[PDB]
Amino acid sequence: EIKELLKLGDLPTSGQIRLYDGRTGEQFERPVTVGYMYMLKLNHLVDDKM
Amino acid sequence: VLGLYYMTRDCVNAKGEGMVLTGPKEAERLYRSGLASLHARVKVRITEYE
Amino acid sequence: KPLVGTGMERAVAVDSGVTAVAKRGGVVQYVDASRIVIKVNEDEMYPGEAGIDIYNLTKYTRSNQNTCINQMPCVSLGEPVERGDVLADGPSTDLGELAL
Amino acid sequence: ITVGPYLRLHQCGLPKKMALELFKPFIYGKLELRGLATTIKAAKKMVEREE
Amino acid sequence: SVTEFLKPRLVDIEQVSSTHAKVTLEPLERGFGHTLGNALRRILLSSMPGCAVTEVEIDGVLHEYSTKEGVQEDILEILLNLKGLAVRVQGKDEVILTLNKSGIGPVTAADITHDGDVEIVKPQHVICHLTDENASISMRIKVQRGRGYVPASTRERPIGRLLVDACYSPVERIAYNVEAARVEQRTDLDKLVIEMETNGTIDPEEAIRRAATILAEQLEAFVDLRDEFDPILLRPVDDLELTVRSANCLKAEAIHYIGDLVQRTEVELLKTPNLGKKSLTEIKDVLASRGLSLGMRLENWPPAS
Amino acid sequence: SVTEFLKPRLVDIEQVSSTHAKVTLEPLERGFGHTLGNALRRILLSSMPGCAVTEVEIDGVLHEYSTKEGVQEDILEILLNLKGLAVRVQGKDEVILTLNKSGIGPVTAADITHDGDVEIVKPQHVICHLTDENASISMRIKVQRGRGYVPASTRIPIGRLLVDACYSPVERIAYNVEAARVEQRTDLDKLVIEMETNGTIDPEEAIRRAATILAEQLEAFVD
């Protein structure tokens, strides 16, 4: 079902694409898994630690 | 470890396979120019000290 | 909102009590960043009363962990509401769903 | 602690806000040594202002 | 010939939309397409100039963690909306715009009072909403030119002036491609196509020219490759109101400045001829009158004069 | 104030050898170290005019995997020795040299017939060794002018051996970016470039020529 939904959006089925280095413009040698993840900021702030 | 392992593996039929090089500097020039593969099997002139 | 969830976000958002939930159905008579006034439906009114509900929202309040508690409206002027609908989102809530 | 990939084996990365407090009497002595401060209170105020 | 490179030129510009463009450079030698493309992308994403909102004053508000009666949004949300206002300034590096509105409805960028040297490229940009008929808003917005990203915390003010983080860069994204060029009689030349996405406040051709100028100015360094004491210490000794015999004793020791005097210890002064304990006590008293003492150590004296 | 950028004030040159150098520049704007370093490295590696040996012919050799009697090295070792020969040609863009030797000892570049236009950078460069006394070596070496590096397999009479052409004088080029600060600004770049050439030109001249090429590539857009 994930592959079908990727097909509906015209995206590669494997979930991996080609990337380029920002500093040089050179392509990385292997496909890379790129997508979206839900991230959280926790209550351990370095302002309260130092 | 992953990077050193990746750079020291060989592939059966890679770009630039079978050429004779004058030394490591020529190998680095060939790799950075895109003319040879990192895993290509070649013959290189090496000087070692004991 | 997570964009990849499980279906339990709305229940957690509503049962926590951090949002404003309509006690009776009606129409949004007044909307503002701090208060909401709902004009109650005729058949949900008690005899001898003025059929309006008023919700005063919580704005930039300190919590037990020294964080911010703030409520924002999620309805527009003149739109219908029903009993149980979300009128305003609390912290970490997006259109009535948990958003951490 | 975070990672420093550029460091040499004998080096560490210290925030300068910590280092300013840690090395305060050394800074006082160095300020008095080269004529920037004539008394201890002048050096103390100069460090407090963080010039 | 071998030492004869073909110089690229700007061929055509395709204005796909008001904020989306394509620029073509042709012809390019073998390998120069990527070399130019990556450097141009980095410079375009890094160093283009633009204008941004930096300060806002609203008549009835004191800080940003508050609300205004009859307004749907918080002050923070209004500031966030104003952070995304695209403005083009034609003649100066600073301007103040005025906004006045009343009545029920959306307050957008088209309600800003007209200015001769100010252009609004997206008049439909929503700023806030007024939900009451007897409600009005009036504010003053400061816009200035710059480059990069300057947070408001890094850069007294009266109560009621609200600071806004500044994102000056007008470029949203850059892409580039290298393709084959069908030149008259060769098949080893390339063509560089640069796709540019901005906010509509900068022309693509001038952006390309500005990036090229910056790159050339940075290159010109490689093209030609080659390799406080305290004031009181600087005052003369006679500034001290020393007695005649004390002054004579200090002159006999070749002491002409306070910095010379304070470095000498009490023992050395005592051992000097013609100087008793009374005169040394007087010298200590006059030094103490200015918060100085004998026995101080200094590095690099005399002070190079 | 928006069109002005920092420029390097310290340019330190360390001369490791006559053909090996380090150049340090600072301060730079954030991110410009990688830009300049990558551009210069690409130009030095891939596009640099020079003269190089292209192909050879030996009377007693008809194939790469052939046997030559009286010489210590094999054919591919002779080709490797020829690939590392540094020359300067100022007359034209294609010259042919002849090498004839006999006896016992090291046959070097100094045994090549002299020519007014051609020059040998390192006469001590060893071509081969002659072991037997009644052994003679005769060969013809073609030198051409070009740019960069051209592998011999991309170009695939009798007895003609193809040699990889190394036109660029650059043997090695690398760069690194480090931190640097002015008293107020702290996140600035510092560029270190280490490069070695073959001896035809000095590394500083190579850097200047690469920078000149890049600057001339931009003349249509620079204001």
From Swiss-Prot, chain C:
Reported uses of this protein in biotechnology and industry = Co-administration of salinamide and rifampicin or salinamide and myxopyronin suppresses the emergence of resistance to both antibiotics.
- State the signal peptide span: none
This protein's source sits in the domain of life called Bacteria
PTM (free text):
Acetylated on several lysine residues in the presence of glucose.
Give the family this protein belongs to, as stated in its UniProt record: Belongs to the RNA polymerase beta chain family.
Its function? DNA-dependent RNA polymerase (RNAP) catalyzes the transcription of DNA into RNA using the four ribonucleoside triphosphates as substrates.
Quaternary structure, from the entry: The RNAP catalytic core consists of 2 alpha, 1 beta, 1 beta' and 1 omega subunit. When a sigma factor is associated with the core the holoenzyme is formed, which can initiate transcription. The rRNA transcription and antitermination complex (rrnTAC) consists of RNAP, NusA, NusB, NusE (rpsJ), NusG, SubB, ribosomal protein S4, DNA and precursor rRNA; S4 is more flexible than other subunits. In pull-down experiments interacts with CedA. (Microbial infection) Interacts (via flap domain) with Escherichia phage lambda antitermination protein Q; this interaction renders bacterial RNAP resistant to transcription pausing and allows it to read through termination signals.
Q: What is this protein called?
A: DNA-directed RNA polymerase subunit beta
* Residue window of the full protein shown: 697 to 796 of 1342
Curated annotation (Swiss-Prot), chain D:
Used in biotech as follows: Co-administration of salinamide and rifampicin or salinamide and myxopyronin suppresses the emergence of resistance to both antibiotics.
Q: How is it modified after translation?
A: Acetylated on several lysine residues in the presence of glucose.
Q: Which pairs of Cys residues are joined through disulfide bonds in the record?
A: none
Give the family this protein belongs to, as stated in its UniProt record.
Belongs to the RNA polymerase beta' chain family.
UniProt function note = DNA-dependent RNA polymerase (RNAP) catalyzes the transcription of DNA into RNA using the four ribonucleoside triphosphates as substrates. Resistance to the antibiotics salinamide A, salinamide B, rifampicin, streptolydigin, CBR703, myxopyronin, and lipiarmycin can result from mutations in this protein.
Q: How does it assemble?
A: The RNAP catalytic core consists of 2 alpha, 1 beta, 1 beta' and 1 omega subunit. When a sigma factor is associated with the core the holoenzyme is formed, which can initiate transcription. The rRNA transcription and antitermination complex (rrnTAC) consists of RNAP, NusA, NusB, NusE (rpsJ), NusG, SubB, ribosomal protein S4, DNA and precursor rRNA; S4 is more flexible than other subunits.
Q: Tell me what this protein is called.
A: DNA-directed RNA polymerase subunit beta'
Q: Which organism is it from?
A: Escherichia coli (strain K12)
Gene name of the record: rpoC
Q: Which residues of the full protein are shown?
A: 355 to 405 of 1407
Curated annotation (Swiss-Prot), chain F:
- Consequence recorded when altering residue 42 to C: In rpoA112; temperature-sensitive, blocks RNA polymerase assembly
GO biological process, alphabetically ordered: bacterial-type flagellum assembly; bacterial-type flagellum-dependent cell motility; cell motility; cellular response to cell envelope stress; DNA-templated transcription initiation; intracellular iron ion homeostasis; nitrate assimilation; regulation of DNA-templated transcription elongation
- Name the reported effect of residue 181 to C: In rpoA101; temperature-sensitive
Which intervals of the chain are annotated as region Alpha N-terminal domain (alpha-NTD)? Answer: 1-223
**Mod. after translation:** (Microbial infection) ADP-ribosylated on both alpha subunits by the phage T4 protein ModA. ADP-ribosylated on only one of the alpha subunits by the phage T4 protein Alt.
Q: What is its EC number?
A: 2.7.7.6
**Catalytic activity, as annotated:** RNA(n) + a ribonucleoside 5'-triphosphate = RNA(n+1) + diphosphate
- Gene Ontology CC annotations of this record: cytoplasm; cytosol; cytosolic DNA-directed RNA polymerase complex; membrane; transcription elongation factor complex
User: Would the keyword Transcription turn up in this protein's UniProt record?
Assistant: yes
UniProt keywords (A-Z) are:
Acetylation, ADP-ribosylation, DNA-directed RNA polymerase, Nucleotidyltransferase, Transcription, Transferase
**One GO molecular-function entry:** DNA binding
Q: How does it assemble?
A: Homodimer. The RNAP catalytic core consists of 2 alpha, 1 beta, 1 beta' and 1 omega subunit. When a sigma factor is associated with the core the holoenzyme is formed, which can initiate transcription. Both the N- and C-terminus interact with different regions of transcriptional regulator CRP. The rRNA transcription and antitermination complex (rrnTAC) consists of RNAP, NusA, NusB, NusE (rpsJ), NusG, SubB, ribosomal protein S4, DNA and precursor rRNA; S4 is more flexible than other subunits.
Free-text comment on this protein's domains from its UniProt entry? The N-terminal domain is essential for RNAP assembly and basal transcription, whereas the C-terminal domain is involved in interaction with transcriptional regulators (such as CRP) and with upstream promoter elements.
Family, according to the entry, reads as follows: Belongs to the RNA polymerase alpha chain family.
Q: Which gene encodes it?
A: rpoA
